[PDB]
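The data layer described in this paper is built around a simple, fixed record for each protein. Such a record has a labelled line for the sequence and another for the backbone structure tokens. For reference, a complete record is included directly beneath this paragraph.
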Amino acid sequence: TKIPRGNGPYSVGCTDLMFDHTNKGTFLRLYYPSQDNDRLDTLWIPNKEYFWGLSKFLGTHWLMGNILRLLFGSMTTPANWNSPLRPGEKYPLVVFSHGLGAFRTLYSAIGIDLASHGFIVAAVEHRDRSASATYYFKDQSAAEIGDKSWLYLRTLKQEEETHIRNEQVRQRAKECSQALSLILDIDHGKPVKNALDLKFDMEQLKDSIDREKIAVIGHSFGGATVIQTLSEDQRFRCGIALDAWMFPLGDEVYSRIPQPLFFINSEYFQYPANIIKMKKCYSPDKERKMITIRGSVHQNFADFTFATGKIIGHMLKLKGDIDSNVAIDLSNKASLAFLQKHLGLHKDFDQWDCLIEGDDENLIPGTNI
């Protein structure tokens, strides 16, 4: 039940930004390289209503909601809550898009590794009802009183899925572009009142972003987000789609993606119909790559892979054959390779270029479908 620390040189900080306070403003968790490395560790799932959301998502009873709370409610992630940003450089920025039933905090294994290598990571929380739960404030007085308003996962009928999944991944793309704009506006001084009263001052992020070096990363629905997002906003220079779920994308986007794009898949999630859509994005004029992590399952990319033991994990499909640490290191080192290659990072990550090709015992070049 331990999320792995950042393997890179930088001490990693973490905080939450919401702005504006509304249903229509941006909500994200930042993972950044931190000055001091001796703040408290960050509360992994920091409100009760998330556990209730996960129950509604998993399809448990009113009960397991508080079970999950009992077992996980006090779990931390190895990021220095509200630590000062490490000054003296413009860091590359990743926007990260959670999967269905996820929310902003469940991809901390990946955020903390990227920050420990020099990235700022904004992990958005979508308000398309794709999250188990999210929240916002109704009006200023509410945000002033801390009066949270909770939006829970929407379950769909067979007859809705096509249409509403598409409207949701568009809203997800919009949300990734809005988070990018909020962060770039903060980088250039626009004053912002965080709707969460937190010990991190947001004036710290002034001239902290390398505004030419931006990538969108996302698991599952998050992989569809990446693809849709890249389609709509070229500020995103390349995309990494972790185990994309391609159902939400209209046929129109496969034409419409200039930026390099890297499919990192688990062995046991993928299927013909889905793989056939990934292939649609390929073209001789554009850089697409695809590796499959051997032994991996869909959930090997999110942090619940790390929240139980061997036998319980494989029981609930949060763990596969491969070790969880091996799989996120491979995912993460191939990620850092693709980011250096296509953002132009002045770093040592090209040592892992062989992973982008799937030359490792635990990688399959392309797909097993």
Summary: The chain has ten helices and 13 strands. The first strand starts at residue 12 and ends at 19. The chain has one domain: 1-369. Residues 1-369 form one domain.
